[PDB]
RNA sequence: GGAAGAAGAGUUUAUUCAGAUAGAUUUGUCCGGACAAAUCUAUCUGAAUAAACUCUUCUUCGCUGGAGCAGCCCCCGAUUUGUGGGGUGAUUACAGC
C-alpha cells in the first residue's frame, strides 16, 4: 500500500510508537523474552520447539539495535534511507516466521474460518507495514497497539478476514494491566512473612482456645516453631554490604568421618545458615582485612532494630573496633579497671589471682547439684522416654567397667535395651562377666529386674547410696573435681585470641545510655512515631492473659513474643518497598495501603494511593517527579486522596492528545523549512530567534520525544508563536487545562 | 512407643499468579452501531512458595585433656528479656585413641 511512497508528514504515528518502545526498553530489557515466552513461562506446556526455544534464549540484546535503527529511520525525513531493507539471511527473520506460524496455527485451532490467508509476508528484502507492526507488537502494550492498528494503517479495513488478522498480530502482545512479576525472591519473602505472622502462639493457644483434650493446622493454626533469626539474617544481608554470615555444608577411630565445616561461600542456594542454640557467626570485611565474631540473639535483635532507625552502619563500625580493644586489655590485665575486667573470661583472671574460689565451696556446690539432678531423675522414672532411660542405665555399667567400652559394641547394646529384650542384655552381661570386663556385682543386681523402670530405679538407688557414703577421694573422682591440668598457659591464650565473643548487652550501653525504657517500650515508640502505623492482625486477647496475674504464670513469655513480632512487621515492608529504586523512599505506609505524598499546597492533599498489588510493577507505573508534574499541569481542581486509576485515566489521555498534535505540527514545520532553505537542531540554529529561544524549542520537542516533561511554562508560548510565524497554527489548549 | 541428619516418594491446608468464561459501572473510536482498554463480583484449568502428616533407603549415637568472654537455670525487683548475684560432672568455629 505505497509503503515506500508513504513519506513526509503523512506518516508520523509510528514516531510516537517507537518513542514509547524506547522508554519501555529502558524500563526492562527482558520484555522481549517475556513476550516471546508469554504462553510457556507460567504454564505447564510449551508449544515452542526445543530448537526454537534455544534460538529465542540465545537471541538477546541484538534485536534492540534493529529496533533503534528502525526508529531513527521512521523518525526523520532527512536521513537514514537504507535502514528499512533487511537481508533474509538474518536469524531474527527466522524466529519471526516461526512465531508467526505458531500463532496462525493457534488461531486456526479456532475452526471458524480457513478460506483466506492472513497477510504478514515481507516482499523479499523489503518489509511491509505488516512486518513493522508485528515487530512493534513486542515492547508495547495492548492499547497502543490497537491505536496503531487504527485507521492510520490500511489493514484496519473490516472484512471477514479482519478479525483473524486482529487476533494473530495481537497474540504476543501484553495487556497494560498488572502482569505483575511474581517469582522475585523479595515478594516470596514478604508473602510468607505475613502468612507466618498470622498465627496463634502456642502457649496462648494452650489455654484460650485450649481444649481439655487434644483441628491441628486446619482452622486456626498454631506456630510450632519461631523463625525470627532466619528473616533477620536475610534482612541484614540485604541492607548492608560488608556482613555475610557463615553457612554449613556436608561433604566427604574418628578419622575422615564427615564433619560439618563452617564456610562463607555464597555460591549455593541450598546452603542453610549455622544456628546452634541461638548463636551465629558474622564476617566484617573492610579496609585492611577480614575479621569475624560470634554473637547471640540478644546482640542480634538490638542491631536489627538499630538499622531501621538509620544509624545502623555506624554501629557496624564499632564492631570492627572491638577486637583491637580486647588486645589492649590482654597487656594490662593487672593494670586495667573493672569495666575491662568484665570483658575477659574467667580463666584469664584466675591466673592473676583475682576470683579464686575455695575448694570446699566448690565441693559443696557440685555435690548438692548432682544429688538434686539424680533425685529428680528418680521421680521422673515413668515420664522419661526410652532414649534417655537407656543411656542412663548404660552409663552406670560403662562407668563400673574397668575397660572403656568399644564404640561399636555400644550400638548393639543400646538396640537390645530399647528393644525391650532384657534377655539379650543379661546375655551380654554374662558374656562380659566371664572375661571379667565388668564386676559380678552388677550382674547379680541386674538379673532380678525384668522391666526398664525396675532397672532404672535399682541404678538410681545405687547411685544415691554411693553419693550418701562419707567423704573420700573416690567422691572427688566420681564428681570430677580430681582431674589435673597439664596444658601451658600460652597455648590457651593463643586459642582465646583466635576465638573471641561479644559481651552480653554491649550495644545497649553505647547509645541508649539514658534510657529507662525496656525493649517493648523502645520498639513501640518507634512503631508509633516513625511510621509503622499498624499493629499485628492478632487481637490483644491472645498476647495477654487476664485471669492470671501479670507477672505470675506464663505471661512473661508472650509479652516478649509480641515485642519481637512487631519488629518482624517492619522488616516485611522493606522487602516490598525496595522493589523500585527511584521512588519508594518518600512512600509512607498506612493501614494496608501505600501512599505517595505530593506537597502541592502547604496543606498536603495531593497524596496518591496504591494497593499492595498495584505497587507491584505493572506496565502503567513510572517514575516519581513526572507524577507531580502531570498533576500540577493537568487536572488541578481535584483535591484529596486520589486513587491512582483516576490519574491514569485522566492525565495520560490529555498528554497523548497534546503530544500527537504537537509532534505532527513540528514535523510539518521541519519539512517546510527544509524545502524553503534550498538534524541536531540545525533548523532552529538557522532561525533568527535568540539562542535561548532555540534551546527552548528544541527542549520542548525533545521533552515530548522522551515522554517526560520538565519545561517551564513560558517555553510553550514561544514554541506556539514561532510555529505560527511559518504560517501553520493549531490550538492544543495546554495551559490551565 | 528409640533420637537426630540426609536422600527420595507422596498426601491436604491456607494465601499469590497466568490463560479463558459472564454482569454492572465508566472512558474513546468509527458511520444508533460494534469494538478497544480499565475497577469490582461469580466460573474453569494449570503453575510456584509455605505448614503439617504418612512411607522407603542410608548414616551417626562411645573414652581422654582445655574453655562456661558465649548459650540455659535459681535468688532479688519489675507494665516485665536487667552491664543486680550464684550455679551449671559441657552444647562445641576445636585437638587425641
DSSP class per residue in A94-135:
HHHHHHHHHHHHHHHHSTT--SSPPP----TTS--HHHHHHH
**Whether A540 CB is under 7 Å from strand B:** no
**Whether A180 CB is under 7 Å from strand B:** yes
**Whether A365 CB is under 7 Å from strand B:** yes
PDB experimental method: cryo-EM
**Whether A278 CB is under 7 Å from strand B:** yes
CA distances to A127, A423, A457, A719 from A450, rounded to whole Å, are 95, 9, 12, 106
Q: In degrees, to the nearest 5, what angle opens at C-alpha A642 toward C-alphas A640 and A644?
A: 165
Closest protein residue to B63 (Cα–C1')? A404
**Whether A553 CB is under 7 Å from strand B:** no
Q: In degrees, to the nearest 5, what angle opens at C-alpha A292 toward C-alphas A290 and A295?
A: 155
Residue A474 half-sphere exposure toward CB, CA atoms < 13 A: 6
Q: Which nucleotide is nearest to A254 (CA to C1')?
A: B97
CA–C1' distance A292–B15 (Å)? Answer: 40
CA–C1' distance A629–B21 (Å)? Answer: 41
Q: Which nucleotide is nearest to A385 (CA to C1')?
A: B2
**Whether A516 CB is under 7 Å from strand B:** no
Q: Which nucleotide is nearest to A387 (CA to C1')?
A: B2
Burial class for A14, CB neighbours closer than 10 Å (0-12, 13-18, 19+): buried
**Whether A557 CB is under 7 Å from strand B:** yes
Find how far residue A305's CA is from the centre of its chain.
18
Q: What is the dihedral of CA A568, A573, A575, A580, to 10 degrees?
A: -170
**Whether A192 CB is under 7 Å from strand B:** yes
CA–C1' distance A249–B7 (Å)? Answer: 15
How far the first Cα of chain A sits from its last, in Å, is 39
**Which residues are registered as beta bridge partners of A279?**
A296
CA–C1' distance A253–B96 (Å)? Answer: 10
Q: Which nucleotide is nearest to A498 (CA to C1')?
A: B93
Q: Are A109 and A167 in contact (CB under 8 A)?
A: no
- What is the DSSP track for A300-358? HHHHHHHIIIIIHHHHHHHHHHHHHHHHHHHH-TTTS-HHHHTTS-HHHHHHTTTT---
**Which residues are registered as beta bridge partners of A610?**
A594
Torsion sign, CA atoms A250, A415, A276, A227: positive
What are A681's three cell numbers?
537542531
Q: Which of residues 578-637 of A touch strand B (CB under 7 A)?
A: 613, 616
Q: Which nucleotide is nearest to A649 (CA to C1')?
A: B27
Cα A249 to Cα A260: distance, rounded to the nearest angstrom = 6
**Whether A179 CB is under 7 Å from strand B:** yes
Q: Which nucleotide is nearest to A368 (CA to C1')?
A: B87
Q: Which of residues 130-149 of A touch strand B (CB under 7 A)?
A: 142-143, 146
Under 8 Å CB-to-CB from A574, ≥6 apart: which residues? Answer: A235, A238, A239
CA distances to A175, A345, A583, A618 from A579, rounded to whole Å, are 21, 46, 9, 12
Calculate helix-pair angle for A63-75, A129-137, nearest 10 degrees.
130
Cα A652 to Cα A631: distance, rounded to the nearest angstrom = 10
Under 8 Å CB-to-CB from A533, ≥6 apart: which residues? Answer: A589, A590, A591
Q: Which of A406, A410, A366, A415 is nearest to A387 (CA)?
A: A415
Cα A97 to Cα A106: distance, rounded to the nearest angstrom = 14
Record the resolution, in angstroms.
3.5
Q: Which nucleotide is nearest to A366 (CA to C1')?
A: B89
Cα A615 to Cα A621: distance, rounded to the nearest angstrom = 8
Cα A539 to Cα A668: distance, rounded to the nearest angstrom = 67
Q: Which of residues 61-80 of A touch strand B (CB under 7 A)?
A: none
Cα A557 to Cα A203: distance, rounded to the nearest angstrom = 9
Q: Which nucleotide is nearest to A182 (CA to C1')?
A: B17
CA–C1' distance A435–B82 (Å)? Answer: 59
Cα A188 to Cα A565: distance, rounded to the nearest angstrom = 19
CA–C1' distance A144–B30 (Å)? Answer: 17
Cα A320 to Cα A404: distance, rounded to the nearest angstrom = 47
Q: Which of A118, A112, A69, A76 is nearest to A92 (CA)?
A: A69
Closest protein residue to B83 (Cα–C1')? A505
Q: Where are the domains of chain A?
A: 8-170, 238-337, 380-468, 580-737
Instruction: List protein-proximal bases of chain B (any atom < 7 A from a CB).
Output: 1-3, 5-7, 13-19, 27-30, 36-39, 46-53, 60-72, 78-83, 86-94, 96-97
CA–C1' distance A21–B77 (Å)? Answer: 69
- What is the DSSP track for A597-653? ----SSS----EEE-HHHHTT-TT---SHHHHHHHHHS--S--S-EEHHHHHHHHHH
Cα A289 to Cα A41: distance, rounded to the nearest angstrom = 44
Closest protein residue to B61 (Cα–C1')? A411
Q: Which nucleotide is nearest to A175 (CA to C1')?
A: B37
CA–C1' distance A493–B81 (Å)? Answer: 32
Cα A638 to Cα A412: distance, rounded to the nearest angstrom = 83
CA–C1' distance A292–B70 (Å)? Answer: 14
CA–C1' distance A591–B27 (Å)? Answer: 31
- What is the DSSP track for A515-533? ----HHHHHHHHIIIII--
Largest CA distance in chain A: 125
A608 φ, ψ (degrees, to nearest 5): -115, 150
Q: Which nucleotide is nearest to A509 (CA to C1')?
A: B83
Residue A44 half-sphere exposure toward CB, CA atoms < 13 A: 0
Residues in chain A: 737
**Whether A485 CB is under 7 Å from strand B:** yes
CA–C1' distance A388–B87 (Å)? Answer: 24
Amino acid at each position: 500500500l505505497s509503503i515506500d511512497e508513504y513519506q513526509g508528514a503523512r506518516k508520523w504515528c509510528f514516531t510516537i510508537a517507537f518513542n514509547k518502545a524506547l522508554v519501555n526498553r529502558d524500563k526492562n530489557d527482558g520484555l522481549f523474552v517475556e513476550s516471546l515466552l508469554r504462553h510457556e513461562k507460567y504454564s505447564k506446556h510449551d508449544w515452542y520447539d526445543e530448537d526454537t526455544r534455544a534460538l529465542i534464549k540465545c537471541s538477546t540484546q541484538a534485536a534492540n539495535a534493529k529496533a533503534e535503527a528502525l526508529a531513527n529511520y521512521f523518525s526523520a525525513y532527512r536521513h537514514s534511507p537504507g535502514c528499512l531493507t533487511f537481508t533474509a539471511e538474518d536469524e531474527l527473520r527466522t524466529i519471526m516466521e516461526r512465531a508467526y506460524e505458531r500463532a496462525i496455527f493457534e488461531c486456526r485451532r479456532r475452526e471458524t474460518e480457513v478460506i483466506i490467508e492472513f497477510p504478514s509476508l515481507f516482499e523479499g528484502d523489503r518489509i511491509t507495514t505488516a512486518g513493522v507492526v508485528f515487530f512493534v507488537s513486542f515492547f508495547v502494550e495492548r492499547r497502543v497497539l490497537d491505536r496503531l492498528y487504527g485507521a492510520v494503517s490500511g489493514l484496519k479495513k473490516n472484512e471477514g478476514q479482519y478479525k483473524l488478522t486482529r487476533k494473530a498480530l495481537s497474540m504476543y502482545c501484553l495487556k497494560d494491566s498488572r502482569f505483575t512479576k511474581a517469582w522475585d525472591k523479595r515478594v516470596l519473602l514478604f508473602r510468607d512473612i505475613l502468612a507466618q505472622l498470622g498465627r496463634i502462639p502456642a502457649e496462648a493457644y494452650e489455654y484460650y482456645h485450649g481444649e481439655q483434650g487434644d483441628d491441628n493446622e486446619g482452622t486456626n493454626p498454631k506456630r510450632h516453631k519461631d523463625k525470627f533469626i532466619e528473616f533477620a539474617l536475610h534482612y541484614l544481608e540485604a541492607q548492608h554490604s560488608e556482613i555475610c554470615f557463615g553457612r554449613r555444608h556436608i561433604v566427604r577411630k574418628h578419622r575422615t568421618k564427615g564433619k560439618v565445616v563452617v564456610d562463607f561461600s555464597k555460591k549455593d542456594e541450598d546452603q542453610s545458615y549455622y544456628i546452634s542454640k541461638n548463636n551465629v557467626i558474622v564476617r566484617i570485611d573492610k579496609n585492611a582485612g577480614p575479621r569475624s565474631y560470634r554473637m547471640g540473639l540478644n546482640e542480634l535483635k538490638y542491631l536489627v532494630l538499630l538499622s531501621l532507625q538509620g544509624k545502623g552502619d555506624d554501629a557496624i563500625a564499632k564492631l570492627y573496633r572491638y577486637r583491637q580493644h580486647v588486645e589492649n586489655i590482654l597487656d594490662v590485665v593487672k593494670v586495667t579497671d573493672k569495666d575491662n575486667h568484665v570483658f575477659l573470661p574467667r580463666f584469664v583472671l584466675e591466673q592473676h589471682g583475682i576470683g579464686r574460689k575455695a575448694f570446699k565451696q566448690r565441693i559443696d556446690g557440685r555435690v548438692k547439684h548432682v544429688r538434686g539432678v539424680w533425685e529428680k531423675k528418680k521421680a521422673a522414672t515413668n515420664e522419661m522416654t526410652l532414649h534417655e532411660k537407656a543411656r542412663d542405665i548404660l552409663q552406670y555399667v560403662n562407668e563400673n567397667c574397668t575397660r572403656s567400652f568399644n564404640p561399636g559394641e555400644y550400638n548393639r547394646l543400646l538396640v537390645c535395651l530399647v528393644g525391650k529384650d532384657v534377655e539379650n542384655f543379661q546375655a551380654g552381661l554374662k558374656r562380659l562377666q566371664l572375661a571379667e570386663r565388668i564386676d559380678g556385682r552388677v550382674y547379680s543386681i541386674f538379673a532380678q529386674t525384668s522391666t526398664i523402670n525396675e532397672m532404672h530405679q535399682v541404678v538410681c538407688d545405687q547411685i544415691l547410696n554411693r553419693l550418701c557414703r562419707i567423704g573420700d577421694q573416690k567422691l572427688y573422682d566420681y564428681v570430677g573435681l580430681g582431674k589435673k591440668d597439664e596444658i601451658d598457659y600460652k597455648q590457651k591464650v593463643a586459642w582465646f585470641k583466635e576465638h573471641i565473643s561479644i559481651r552480653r548487652g554491649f550495644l545497649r550501653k553505647k547509645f541508649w545510655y539514658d534510657s529507662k525504657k525496656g525493649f517493648a517500650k523502645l520498639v513501640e515508640e518507634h512503631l508509633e512515631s516513625g511510621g509503622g502505623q499498624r499493629d499485628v492482625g492478632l487481637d490483644k486477647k491472645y498476647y495477654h492473659i487476664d485471669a492470671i496475674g501479670r507477672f505470675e504464670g506464663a505471661n512473661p513469655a508472650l509479652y516478649e513474643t509480641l515485642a519481637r513480632d512487631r519488629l518482624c512487621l517492619m522488616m516485611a515492608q522493606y522487602f516490598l518497598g525496595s522493589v523500585r529504586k527511584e521512588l519508594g523512599n518518600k512512600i509512607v505506609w498506612s493501614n494496608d495501603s501505600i501512599e505517595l505524598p505530593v506537597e502541592g499546597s502547604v496543606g498536603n492533599e495531593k497524596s496518591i494511593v496504591f494497593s499492595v498489588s498495584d505497587y507491584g510493577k505493572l506496565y502503567v507505573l513510572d517514575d516519581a517527579e513526572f507524577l507531580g508534574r502531570i498533576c500540577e499541569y493537568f487536572m488541578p481542581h481535584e483535591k484529596g486522596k486520589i486513587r491512582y486509576h483516576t490519574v491514569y485515566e485522566k492525565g495520560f489521555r490529555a498528554y497523548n492528545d497534546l503530544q500527537k498534535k504537537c509532534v505532527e505540527a513540528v514535523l510539518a514545520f521541519e519539512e517546510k523549512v527544509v524545502k524553503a532553505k534550498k538534524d541536531f537542531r540545525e533548523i532552529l540554529a538557522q532561525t533568527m530567534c535568540k539562542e535561548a529561544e532555540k534551546t527552548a524549542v528544541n527542549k520542548v520537542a525533545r521533552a515530548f520525544f522522551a515522554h517526560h516533561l520538565k519545561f517551564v511554562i513560558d517555553e510553550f508560548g514561544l514554541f506556539s508563536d514561532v510555529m505560527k510565524k511559518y504560517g501553520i497554527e493549531k490550538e492544543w489548549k495546554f495551559p490551565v487545562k
